[PDB]
Predict the structure of S-layer protein A.
Amino acid sequence: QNTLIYVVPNGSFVGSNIKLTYTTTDYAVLHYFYSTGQYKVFKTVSVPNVT
Amino acid sequence: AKTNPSAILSLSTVNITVVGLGGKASVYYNSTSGQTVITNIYGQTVATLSG
Amino acid sequence: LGSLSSEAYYHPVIWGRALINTTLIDTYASGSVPFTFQLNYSVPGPLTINM
């Protein structure tokens, strides 16, 4: 319901990623602040490279 | 820029620095002509490639 | 935003399909209370009409 698991290969566990784009539910967020490039909004999940 | 701090920001790719021993050259997508301006160490626009 | 300095300190706004929460104050009913809405919109800026 409100849980998630991402699974990935035995080597591409680093550089595994996921892209979230929350999507507008109002049409009119587009208007004149589309040129911000956050009309629909943009974030990601990631695993850092470590040594 | 002059209003909002930064977001996803776009560029006239008006240069790409390629300095060497002497002079410089550049291969720069100039988003105020709408084409690939390519310059060289002679100084001049040597090609200009549409769109 | 960075468009509004210090003149803004007064403004009620909403946009589109996005929710304005309302205050339908009411005391004069019993059982289930149905409500209808009337909204009255108008358009800042000159209005020429194409017909």
In short: Chain B is about 0% helix and 35% strand. Residues 15 and 28 of chain B are 5 Å apart (CA to CA).
